[PDB]
Amino acid sequence: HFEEGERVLAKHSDCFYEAKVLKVEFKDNEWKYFVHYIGWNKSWDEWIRLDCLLKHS
Numbered sequence: 001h002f003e004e005g006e007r008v009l010a011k012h013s014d015c016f017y018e019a020k021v022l023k024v025e026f027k028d029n030e031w032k033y034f035v036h037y038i039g040w041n042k043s044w045d046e047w048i049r050l051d052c053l054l055k056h057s
Helices: none
Strands: 007-012 015-027 032-036 046-049
Touching: 007 032, 007 046
Parallel strands: none
Antiparallel strands: 007 015, 015 032, 032 046
């Protein structure tokens, strides 16, 4: 659904932030995405699930 390198919106807590997908993995019948939040410390990088992601536009 999303690819390595892709600009996306990623939900953290209550709202969506500009982010970039760094890694994609599939395990236990589900996709997960390691995302970086644009402009933010790398310490906030995290694995999130598909329903936490939005394509732009």
